[PDB]
Amino acid sequence: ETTRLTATEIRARISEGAASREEVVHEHLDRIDEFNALTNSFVELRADQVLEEARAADREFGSTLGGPLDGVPLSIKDSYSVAGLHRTDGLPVNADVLDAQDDVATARLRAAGGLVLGHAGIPDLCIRWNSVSGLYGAVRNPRDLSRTAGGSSGGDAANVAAGFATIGLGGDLGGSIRVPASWCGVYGFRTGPGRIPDVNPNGGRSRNVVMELMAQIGPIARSIDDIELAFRIMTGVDRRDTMSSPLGLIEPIEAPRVAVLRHETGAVLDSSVEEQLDATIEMLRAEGYVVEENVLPDLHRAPEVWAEIVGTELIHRVLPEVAELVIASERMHIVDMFGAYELGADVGAYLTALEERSSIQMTVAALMERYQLILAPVAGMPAPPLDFDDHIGREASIALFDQMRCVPWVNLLGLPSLALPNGIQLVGRKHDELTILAAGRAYERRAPRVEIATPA
């Protein structure tokens, strides 16, 4: 069935006349209807509408493929507007927010022929590594339904892992692509500054530049070719996003040196995660990369400064506004974890943190002239139980943060990173996305192909 196949494989079936686009969509919709009650990962569907799109293309063009995503079913995170779908942030108060226009990233996927099946589940506010909302409930991991799918792009990761869609669209502010992609055993690519514009023609709330500098859009998929396809389609300037650039993609570096991050950000790692890190080092070396351990300086401040900057804003701006609109577990995750790092009410403390961010960014940029890739864990543990961050208190929330210290430094410093299905990531410099994907292909050449999960 096409639910098990990559985008290239689906398109080959269509071009050979072995499947219609409508048949492909029906296969995915039927699988969703069978298993989505268990994962709760597709939270809003557009079944009739996407079948009409598929049929339209079948009738007009038949087996001739149009754009590069023609025939390919897609999952889109609730956060990214899709014309005719609701954009809620997980909140019951926003249940009536229905968008007239696609976001630019979504529009590019659809213009290329992509078939959007619906919107994917998220946590309230998209601030959580567990996709639990007031409006839709909890996303459950298709690999083990007792476990979190991660977050904030947990629904998209779950949809791709379950074979409900071929490619997903998420975003990453504090691991929000990489964490759920790894915990659901799929690829998740956080792009870097400039490449994919974040433009919502329906009117978003205005954001602090500091927060905008740390967030990037990216695809989730079961193969690197699908990651790259979606990445290339979405890349391109749009001057409605200040952060967008017309700079082209840069061809992969010849013989990049790889530095290994293990404990240098202070992360607390399970033995099983250390074993995957070691396995990935082995794979890269067998593919001819030079990989070096114990070359990075003490970077424990990097995830801390992320939490200070983000936490101060959540505690002093966001919670005061939305505390009554979010589920209690969301409020308490913010208070329990981000409350441990927030800087208090004094603007001077926040300004000092912003200076430290710049200092760390410059230090890491300088060392990445020698080590153009950093290989690191994503999470310090495999997918935890659904309740792992539910009303756990301050002490346990500090422990959770310590398990996640290989994640948010990437956001702080504005770097692209590919999460691999084994929970290890490849981080690159700004603008060096294709170098990252080349290293990803080295892992892909060595590890078994990603297979879909059947929720049970």
Distances (CA, A) of 364 to 257, 357, 359, 390, 412: 14, 11, 9, 34, 11
Figure out which of the listed residues 346, 387, 395, 451 binds its own copies, where binding follows CB under 8 A: 346
CB of 113 to its own copies, least distance (A): 28
**Are the C-beta atoms of 257 and 372 separated by less than 8 Å?**
yes
Query: Which residue(s) pair with 75 in the sheet?
Result: 118, 168
316 belongs to the binding site for its own copies (CB under 8 A): yes
User: Residue 135's Cα: distance from chain center in Å?
Assistant: 21
> Residues in contact with its own copies, total (CB under 8 A)?
46
Q: Verify whether residue 430 is a known catalytic residue.
A: no
Residue of 20, 75, 77, 79 with catalytic role: 77
247 belongs to the binding site for its own copies (CB under 8 A): yes
Q: Verify whether residue 77 is a known catalytic residue.
A: yes
Figure out which of the listed residues 9, 23, 212, 292 binds its own copies, where binding follows CB under 8 A: 212
Nearer to its own copies, 346 or 395 (CB): 346
Encoded amino acid at 28, one letter: H
Nearer to its own copies, 139 or 314 (CB): 314
Length, in residues, of the chain:
456
Nearer to its own copies, 132 or 213 (CB): 213
Query: Which residue(s) pair with 169 in the sheet?
Result: 76, 219
Figure out which of the listed residues 70, 313, 433, 444 binds its own copies, where binding follows CB under 8 A: 313
Residue of 133, 176, 329, 417 with catalytic role: 176
Angle at 314 between CA 309 and CA 315, to 5 degrees: 100
Ranges within 358-377 binding its own copies (CB under 8 A): 358-359, 361-362, 365-366, 369
Alpha-carbon distance of 50 to 13, in angstroms, equals 19
Nearer to its own copies, 147 or 331 (CB): 331
437 belongs to the binding site for its own copies (CB under 8 A): no
CB of 207 to its own copies, least distance (A): 6
Q: On the CB side of 327, how many CA atoms lie within 13 Å of its CA?
A: 25
User: What tokens were used for 283?
Assistant: 């794979």
Phi, psi (rounded to 5 degrees) for 76:
-120, 130
User: Residue 333's Cα: distance from chain center in Å?
Assistant: 20
Residue of 79, 131, 152, 417 with catalytic role: 152
323 belongs to the binding site for its own copies (CB under 8 A): no
Figure out which of the listed residues 55, 431, 441, 446 binds its own copies, where binding follows CB under 8 A: 431
Looking up tokens 């999960």 gives: 453
Figure out which of the listed residues 49, 63, 202, 352 binds its own copies, where binding follows CB under 8 A: 352
Query: Which residue(s) pair with 119 in the sheet?
Result: 44, 76
Residue 212, SS3 per DSSP: helix
| Positions in the binding site for its own copies (CB under 8 A) | 194, 205-210, 212-213, 239-240, 242, 245-247, 250, 312-313, 316-317, 320, 343-352, 354-359, 361-362, 365-366, 369, 414, 429-431
